[PDB]
Amino acid sequence: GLEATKEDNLPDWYSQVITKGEMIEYYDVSGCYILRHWSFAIWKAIRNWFDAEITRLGVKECYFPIFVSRAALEREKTHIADFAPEVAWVTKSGDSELAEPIAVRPTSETVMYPAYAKWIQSYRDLPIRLNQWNNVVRWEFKHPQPFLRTREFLWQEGHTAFATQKEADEEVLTILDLYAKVYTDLLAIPVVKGRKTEKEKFAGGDYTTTVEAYISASGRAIQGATSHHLGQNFSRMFDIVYEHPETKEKEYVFQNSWGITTRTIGVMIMVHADNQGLVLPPRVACIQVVIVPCGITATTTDDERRRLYESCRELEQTFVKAGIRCEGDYRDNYSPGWKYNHWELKGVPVRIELGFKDLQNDQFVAVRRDNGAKQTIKRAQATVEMPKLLETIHTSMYERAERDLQSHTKLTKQWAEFLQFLETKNIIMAPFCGEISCEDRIKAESARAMGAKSLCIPFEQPAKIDPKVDKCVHPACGRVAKFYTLFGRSY
Amino acid sequence: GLEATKEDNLPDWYSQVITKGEMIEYYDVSGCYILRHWSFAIWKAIRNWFDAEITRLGVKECYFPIFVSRAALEREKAPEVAWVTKSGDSELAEPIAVRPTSETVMYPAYAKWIQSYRDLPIRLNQWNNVVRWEFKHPQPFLRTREFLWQEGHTAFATQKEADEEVLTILDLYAKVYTDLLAIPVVKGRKTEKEKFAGGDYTTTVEAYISASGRAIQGATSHHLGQNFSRMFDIVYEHPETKEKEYVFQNSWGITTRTIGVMIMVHADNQGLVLPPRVACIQVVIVPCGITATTTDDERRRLYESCRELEQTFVKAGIRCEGDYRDNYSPGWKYNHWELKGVPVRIELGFKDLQNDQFVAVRRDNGAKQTIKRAQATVEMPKLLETIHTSMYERAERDLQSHTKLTKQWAEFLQFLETKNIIMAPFCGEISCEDRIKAESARAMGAKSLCIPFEQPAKIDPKVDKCVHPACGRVAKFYTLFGRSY
Ligand SMILES: Cc1cc(N2CC[C@@](C#N)(C3CC3)C2=O)cc(NC(=O)Cc2ccccc2)n1
Ligand SMILES: Cc1cc(N2CC[C@@](C#N)(C3CC3)C2=O)cc(NC(=O)Cc2ccccc2)n1
Ligand SMILES: O=C(C[C@H]1NCCC[C@@H]1O)Cn1cnc2cc(Br)c(Cl)cc2c1=O
Ligand SMILES: O=C(C[C@H]1NCCC[C@@H]1O)Cn1cnc2cc(Br)c(Cl)cc2c1=O
Ligand SMILES: [Br-]
Ligand SMILES: [Br-]
Ligand SMILES: [Br-]
Ligand SMILES: [Br-]
Ligand SMILES: [Cl-]
Ligand SMILES: [Cl-]
Ligand SMILES: [Cl-]
Ligand SMILES: [Zn+2]
Ligand SMILES: [Zn+2]
């Protein structure tokens, strides 16, 4: 059983959910966590779905080295802030100090783009569309949290180069829509699509698009994935050029990069798990249905205790043959109540209870993990009804979370409401001038990590800004509002 | 085109095959290489096949961290591990190591997860990257500082379960080589000198590179017995009598070395030759007969017919692509896809179109065969099987041609200098093996490759003795020896 509640002590409840749910094992290297099989399976489902999508689009998979040279890391950088990256440095091999230290990759721009330059010998080599499924390392000295913010993490990073800007812009949005679908269609999590402000975009790119999710327990937002248009910034840095076929001049390609991580799993937990443990979205759950025989007594029999099991096994096999990931729990040394708790902790979407009674009556009881409701299904209907049920669960889980998100997304034009909404765990849609210094003042004034940050400029604007009358929300700015921006406390 | 020959200058030829075959890009950190998509697709076929296999056996996938603490590493009881000592410009309180293998990462977790008898067995696998920072000469795919692999770690209540699993995994590795890669291998047990020092015995599959004349370990599957469980206190209490029991453990691994062996065995002086079951593209269609007088409607017509055939192949599960580029001649495309090793090239011109046929050319043979279009879906798979069989059988002939059996040291050395591997009676002593290696160099001394599961004859204890003239001992078994990588 869980020993903390999502409302009273979120970090404790989260630690208990990931350990008692057998997702994570803690490690003696801080900021790094063991992914047990139960959570790695969810990553597998996410990874395979996304890879199939981008493969169908024409991206191809490759693998570049974990180590980056110091020369490549520092390439073409001239400002002093650029020269002390927080990368992990390998300085020796056994007892031999190395000639030149080499860095663990925090991301792979620096080692892929020299190769892109070599590989693009003419305009006919374009586009180049590659992706890696790999592990990167960012050794920051802040508070790490499993899944959400770790020093080593698994991800995919796609790096694309095109002859025209139009191609690249289109791809930025196609990839962002895939990431949105990861959250909504696989994980039943609503997200907000938008552009980062100038303050929050990737500094090496032209613009950054994002999907943001909302953690109602803390009232905080978290960036779920990212999709950048780099424009020509890196092509000019790394001389990724080709000769124009018509004008014959040297032209720089247009690039994107895009990435998503195991943070997905963290968001799933933070949004869906409850005070009894995990609640797995049906489409990624390793096991969707567990069958628990019950009604066995001390004097049930032995020759009947096996009959009940036989019927449970028959139903299990039917489910598996219908494409439903199902298992039976026939362990004799654990009570049915124990098994109930154990599989609720692991968040299996449907528990089946099957007792002698219901065997007698051609039926069984299906129990939804997300809301606890029980339903009697005639065995003849198992194959028809159980898929429908799993779809319903996904939909309830999504719509539940969506209503949460919308009821805590508050539109206002008034600074006082901005502050009040922020202290009551909302995120806020407000007219915004877009300026970096104004964003700084908004953050500094809203602090009581408690200052509000911009989350994204949402593609779906809640209303149309009137450039003629609408001003920025902050009382001391006074500039024309360029758009509505989403603000909140950012995880 | 390739500018070295496999039989004259093997390393230059190898480098030209992996670069012009678009497998590898060289890289400014020595001993690490970029895997382009053409080679990574091969690793992916191997990896997905092996994973489906062990998943059906009930092994489950997990992922452990790439960093190992110094204490953890030191529990194993000098090693060329890569040490992280700084983050940015802050020196770390304690240096952490890049995993060279995950025993010291995983087995503490195992000791914790095994709380009672009912938790056994534990059978976990990871697909990950490991680092071994050796200063010896590296070679792409074959010996690298960073490599991709899978490492499996299992724990059982009894030794016999574990012995069986060792053999099961070894058999899968053999199948990767023979069935996926068309490479014959010799299953065997390592000698006491060559086994993994931390286990009880090591099993292996050994392959032979005829060009080099050298043998190479293609995979490994260890029985660790109780060594590691005693080291890491991986215990349970026996349910009746409640004595403390140490679990029995195995580990097993295979790497991108597979791809290296593939090249070394099958590639030729025109480039790669991909075994059909791992080739990312199996069939490539090249449109032929386009003159400078070929009009644009006729070019559209030929391309659309090629694309129709291409998609008919893809729908029937044959991985086929068409090369519809107009800046490259048909002959250029022939050379290009030959360098890349695509098993079948289809040549489809206008005469072919009018006769409802095409020509399929085998990359391995060069042999051409005309096929009526209606029979495409039925003949093309057969051919692909034929290619696999040819490739395997060619390699197996080449391996048995280079496998020699003797009982006399003189013939043994004559064979070693003729680029052969030699089966000889052996006592199995470490000192004697050292002596055998020492008295064959003028590394080019003779090392033991494996004690083969399938012996060439019965080492009669009353008659047969060790092959070295200075060992007086009775021969325990026939051991396969040779020069190795
Ligand atoms: C698990 C995970 C995820 C992510 N990030 C980043 C943005 C992104 C998004 N969206 C990536 C583009 C895809 C994401 O998920 C980042 C991280 N570690 C870190 O920042 C390093 C760290 C370690 C300890 C404490 C503080 C910081 N750890
Ligand atoms: C690509 C690859 C493979 C393998 N090894 C090992 C044995 C094994 C087998 N069998 C593994 C158990 C599965 C194997 O494949 C090993 C390696 N690097 C190294 O030794 C590091 C190194 C670096 C430069 C020069 C010399 C040595 N690199
Ligand atoms: O990592 C990025 C940009 C993009 N890379 C491709 C996948 C998607 C991803 O958002 C931004 N970023 C983030 N963190 C970093 C940390 C360090 Br340390 C360095 Cl050197 C560089 C970076 C750095 O470039
Ligand atoms: O890595 C092994 C033993 C097995 N681990 C699991 C997968 C299969 C593999 O053969 C042997 N080995 C090989 N090379 C090593 C290099 C270093 Br450096 C260290 Cl510390 C340790 C080792 C080390 O333990
Ligand atoms: Br950034
Ligand atoms: Br990032
Ligand atoms: Br070893
Ligand atoms: Br090894
Ligand atoms: Cl696990
Ligand atoms: Cl590409
Ligand atoms: Cl590539
Ligand atoms: Zn403003
Ligand atoms: Zn001897």
Which of A24, A90, A97, A261 to mutate: most B Cβ within 10 Å? A90
Angstrom distance (rounded) from CA B473 to CA B468: 9
Runs of H (alpha helix) within A161-277: 165-181, 233-238, 263-272
Question: Could you tell me how far CA B373 lies from the centroid of its own chain?
Answer: 37
Runs of H (alpha helix) within B114-256: 159-175, 227-232
Specify the residue for token string 């059996």: B405
Provide the β-strand partners of residue A136: A153
| Residue A63 to residue B25, Cβ atoms within 8 A | no
Cα four-point dihedral sign A280, A284, A287, A288: positive
Same domain, B256 and B310: no
3-class state of residue B338 by DSSP: helix
Question: Could you tell me how far CA A188 lies from the centroid of its own chain?
Answer: 11
Same domain, B455 and B359: no
Angstrom distance (rounded) from CA B12 to CA A417: 72
Closest CA to B146 of A46, A68, A18: A68
Residue A185 lies in a domain: yes
CA B393 to ligand 12 center in whole angstroms: 75
Q: What is the Cα gyration radius of chain B? A: 26
Interface of B with A in 291-310 (CB under 8 A): none
* Structural contact between residues A473 and A431, judged by C-beta atoms closer than 8 angstroms: yes
Copy the structure tokens of residue B148.
């991709």
Angstrom distance (rounded) from CA B100 to CA A90: 14
What are φ and ψ of residue B124, in 5° steps?
Answer: -125, 145
Closest CA to A17 of A284, A277, A217: A277
Angstrom distance (rounded) from CA B299 to CA B305: 10
What are the C-alpha distances in Å from A281 to residues A224, A232, A285, A463?
A: 17, 40, 6, 33
Closest CA to A406 of A124, A191, A222, A187: A191
Breaks in chain B (C to N over 2.5 Å), named by the residue before each, are 77, 442
Runs of H (alpha helix) within A263-381: 263-272, 305-321, 336-345, 356-360
Same domain, A258 and A115: yes
Residues B315, B320, B321, CA angle at the centre, nearest 5°? Answer: 120
Q: How far is B41 from chain A (nearest CA, A)?
A: 7
For residue B98, the chain A residues in CB contact (below 8 A) are 66, 90, 104
Question: Could you tell me how far CA A370 lies from the centroid of its own chain?
Answer: 20
3-class state of residue B124 by DSSP: strand
H or E stretch covering B95: strand B90-98
Same domain, A66 and A206: yes
Specify the residue for token string 């078994």: B477
CA A370 to ligand 9 center in whole angstroms: 24
DSSP state of B117: G
What are φ and ψ of residue B32, in 5° steps?
Answer: -120, 140
* Structural contact between residues A221 and A190, judged by C-beta atoms closer than 8 angstroms: no
Angstrom distance (rounded) from CA A468 to CA B92: 56
Contact B211/A at CB under 8 A = no
Pairing relationship of beta strands B283-287 and B320-322 according to DSSP bridges: parallel
Copy the structure tokens of residue A420.
């009040």
Interface of B with A in 52-91 (CB under 8 A): 60-69, 71-72, 78-90
Largest Cα span, chain B: 91
| Dihedral of the alpha carbons of A101, A103, A109, A113, in degrees to the nearest 10 | 30
Which of A46, A67, A113 to mutate: most B Cβ within 10 Å? A67
Copy the structure tokens of residue B245.
């029991």
Edge-to-edge strands, sheet with B82-87: A67-69, A96-104, A88-93, B82-87, B90-98, B67-69
DSSP B14-72: HHHHHHHTTSEE--SSTT--EE-HHHHHHHHHHHHHHHHHHHHTT-EE-B--SEEEHHH
Question: Could you tell me how far CA B457 lies from the centroid of its own chain?
Answer: 28
Same domain, A454 and A306: no
Pairing relationship of beta strands B403-405 and B357-362 according to DSSP bridges: unpaired
Give the closest ligand to the alpha carbon of residue A106.
3
Same domain, B216 and B165: yes
Largest Cα span, chain A: 91
Angstrom distance (rounded) from CA A21 to CA A32: 18
Angstrom distance (rounded) from CA B149 to CA B128: 6
Q: Is A86 annotated as a binding residue?
A: yes
DSSP A408-457: TEEE-S-HHHHHHHHHTT-EEEEEE---HHHHHHHHHHT----S-EEEEE
How many other C-beta atoms lie within 10 A of the C-beta of residue A427? 23
Rounded to the nearest 10 degrees, the angle between the axes of helix B376-401 and helix B296-315 is 70
Closest CA to A398 of A205, A185, A221, A250: A185
The neighbourhood of ligand 7, an ion, using CB within 5 A, equals B 196
Q: Is the CB of A157 under 6 A from ligand 3?
A: yes
CA-proximal residue: ligand 4, atom 2 (nearest): B101
* Structural contact between residues B236 and B119, judged by C-beta atoms closer than 8 angstroms: yes
Ligand 1: nearest atom to the Cα of A153:
1
Angstrom distance (rounded) from CA B217 to CA B206: 5
Angstrom distance (rounded) from CA B218 to CA B204: 7
Question: Could you tell me how far CA A94 lies from the centroid of its own chain?
Answer: 37
3-class state of residue B12 by DSSP: helix
DSSP A36-57: -HHHHHHHHHHHHHHHHHHHHH
For residue B144, the chain A residues in CB contact (below 8 A) are none
Residue B205 lies in a domain: yes
Copy the structure tokens of residue B305.
């017919």
Give the closest ligand to the alpha carbon of residue A107.
3
Which amino acid appears at position B238 of this protein? H
Q: What is the Cα gyration radius of chain A? A: 26
Which residues fall within 8 angstroms of residue B262, CB to CB, at 6 or more apart? Answer: B42, B181, B183, B274, B275, B278
Angstrom distance (rounded) from CA A207 to CA A196: 7
* Structural contact between residues A139 and A89, judged by C-beta atoms closer than 8 angstroms: no
Residue A257 lies in a domain: yes
CA-proximal residue: ligand 3, atom 24 (nearest): A107
Pairing relationship of beta strands A220-231 and A254-261 according to DSSP bridges: antiparallel
Copy the structure tokens of residue B211.
């060009």
Q: How far is B414 from chain A (nearest CA, A)?
A: 40
Cα four-point dihedral sign A381, A382, A387, A389: positive
CA atoms within 13 A on the CB side of A472: 18
Residue B20 lies in a domain: yes
Boundary of a domain, candidates B350, B383, B416: B383
Angstrom distance (rounded) from CA B363 to CA A28: 52
3-class state of residue A35 by DSSP: strand
Q: Is the CB of B155 under 6 A from ligand 4?
A: no
3-class state of residue A198 by DSSP: coil
Closest CA to A90 of A82, A99, A78, A81: A99
Q: Is the CB of A105 under 6 A from ligand 3?
A: no
What CATH number is attached to the domain comprising A182? 3.30.930.10
How many other C-beta atoms lie within 10 A of the C-beta of residue A482? 17
Give the closest ligand to the alpha carbon of residue A213.
1
Q: Is B243 annotated as a binding residue?
A: no
Which residues fall within 8 angstroms of residue B186, CB to CB, at 6 or more apart? Answer: B205, B206, B207, B449, B450, B452, B480
Q: Is the CB of A85 under 6 A from ligand 3?
A: yes
DSSP A283-307: TT-S-SEEEEE----TTS-STTHHH
Residue A26 lies in a domain: yes
DSSP state of A481: P
Angstrom distance (rounded) from CA A6 to CA B148: 40
Q: Is the CB of B80 under 6 A from ligand 4?
A: yes
Same domain, B321 and B452: no
CA-proximal residue: ligand 2, atom 2 (nearest): B143
CA atoms within 13 A on the CB side of B33: 26
H or E stretch covering B94: strand B90-98
What are φ and ψ of residue B320, in 5° steps?
Answer: -125, 140
Same domain, B108 and B45: yes
CA A141 to ligand 11 center in whole angstroms: 36
For residue B133, the chain A residues in CB contact (below 8 A) are 93-94
Closest CA to B270 of B182, B335, B365, B209: B335
For residue A66, the chain B residues in CB contact (below 8 A) are 32, 66, 98, 129, 131, 146
What CATH number is attached to the domain comprising B289? 3.40.50.800
Copy the structure tokens of residue B114.
């095994």
Angstrom distance (rounded) from CA A92 to CA A99: 9
Q: How far is A389 from chain B (nearest CA, A)?
A: 28
H or E stretch covering A228: strand A220-231
Same domain, B372 and B440: no
Copy the structure tokens of residue A185.
């269609």
Angstrom distance (rounded) from CA A141 to CA B403: 59
Note the resolution in Å, 1 decimal: 2.1
DSSP state of B191: P
3-state percent helix, strand, coil for chain A, nearest multiple of 5:
35, 30, 35
* Structural contact between residues A327 and A346, judged by C-beta atoms closer than 8 angstroms: no
Nearest chain A residue to B112 by CA: give it: A25
Q: Is A438 annotated as a binding residue?
A: yes
Boundary of a domain, candidates B266, B293, B318: B266
Structure solved via:
X-ray
Taking phi over 0 as left and psi of -120 to 50 as alpha, with beta for the rest, B31 belongs to left
* Structural contact between residues B259 and B147, judged by C-beta atoms closer than 8 angstroms: no
Residue positions counted in chain B? 485
Which amino acid appears at position B100 of this protein? P
Q: Is the CB of A150 under 6 A from ligand 3?
A: no
Residue B275 lies in a domain: no
Nearest CB to B85 within list A32, A41, A91: A91
Cis peptide before A127 (omega within 30 of 0): yes
Same domain, A345 and A463: no
Copy the structure tokens of residue A321.
């043959």
Residue A444 lies in a domain: yes
Range of the domain at B428: 403-482
Closest CA to A409 of A242, A221, A201: A221
Question: Quick one: A479 exposed, middle or buried, by C-beta within 10 A (0-12, 13-18, 19+)?
Answer: middle
CA atoms within 13 A on the CB side of A113: 26
Closest CA to B277 of B335, B339, B319, B316: B319
Angstrom distance (rounded) from CA B322 to CA B312: 12
Beta strand extents in B193-234 (DSSP E only): 201-209, 214-225
The b/e string for A223-241 (b: 16+ C-beta within 10 A; e otherwise) is bbbbbbbbbbbbbebbebb
Residue A279 lies in a domain: no
Cα four-point dihedral sign B365, B366, B372, B377: positive
Angstrom distance (rounded) from CA A480 to CA A474: 11
Q: Is B432 annotated as a binding residue?
A: yes
Angstrom distance (rounded) from CA A187 to CA A398: 8
Angstrom distance (rounded) from CA A418 to CA A430: 8
DSSP state of B238: -
For residue B61, the chain A residues in CB contact (below 8 A) are 37, 40-41, 44
Residue positions counted in chain A? 491
Q: Is the CB of A142 under 6 A from ligand 1?
A: yes
Angstrom distance (rounded) from CA A317 to CA A314: 5
Nearest chain B residue to A131 by CA: give it: B37
Angstrom distance (rounded) from CA B233 to CA A395: 47
Which amino acid appears at position A124 of this protein? R
Which of A27, A35, A136 to mutate: most B Cβ within 10 Å? A27
What are the C-alpha distances in Å from B193 to residues B84, B188, B196, B433?
A: 33, 14, 9, 8
Residues A398, A400, A401, CA angle at the centre, nearest 5°? Answer: 65
| Residue A37 to residue B61, Cβ atoms within 8 A | yes
Angstrom distance (rounded) from CA B113 to CA B97: 24
Same domain, B253 and B318: no
Q: Is B427 annotated as a binding residue?
A: yes
CA B196 to ligand 4 center in whole angstroms: 8
What CATH number is attached to the domain comprising A467? 3.30.110.30
H or E stretch covering A242: strand A241-243
Boundary of a domain, candidates A246, A272, A298: A272
Q: Is the CB of B100 under 6 A from ligand 4?
A: yes
Angstrom distance (rounded) from CA B404 to CA B410: 13
Contact A365/B at CB under 8 A = no
Same domain, A200 and A346: no
| Dihedral of the alpha carbons of B157, B162, B165, B169, in degrees to the nearest 10 | 120
User: Among B33, B81, B257, B449, which residue has the most ligand 2 atoms within 8 Å of its CB, making it the best to mutate?
Assistant: B257
Cα four-point dihedral sign B458, B461, B463, B466: positive
Residues A276, B63, A35, CA angle at the centre, nearest 5°? Answer: 15
Number of domains in chain B: 3
What are φ and ψ of residue B288, in 5° steps?
Answer: -120, 165
Provide the β-strand partners of residue A225: A211
Which amino acid appears at position A360 of this protein? Q
Interface of B with A in 90-149 (CB under 8 A): 90, 96, 98, 109, 112-113, 118, 124, 128-129, 131, 133, 135, 146, 148
Runs of H (alpha helix) within B181-295: 227-232, 257-266
Beta strand extents in B352-441 (DSSP E only): 357-362, 368-372, 403-405, 421-426
Copy the structure tokens of residue B290.
């386009």
Angstrom distance (rounded) from CA A389 to CA B223: 46
Give the closest ligand to the alpha carbon of residue B25.
11
What are the C-alpha distances in Å from B198 to residues A363, B152, B201, B226?
A: 55, 15, 9, 10
* Structural contact between residues A208 and A228, judged by C-beta atoms closer than 8 angstroms: yes
How many other C-beta atoms lie within 10 A of the C-beta of residue A438? 20
Nearest CB to B40 within list A61, A67, A71: A61
Q: Is A417 annotated as a binding residue?
A: no
* Structural contact between residues B180 and B173, judged by C-beta atoms closer than 8 angstroms: no
Rounded to the nearest 10 degrees, the angle between the axes of helix B37-56 and helix B159-175 is 150
Angstrom distance (rounded) from CA A304 to CA A300: 7
Contact B25/A at CB under 8 A = yes
DSSP state of A480: B
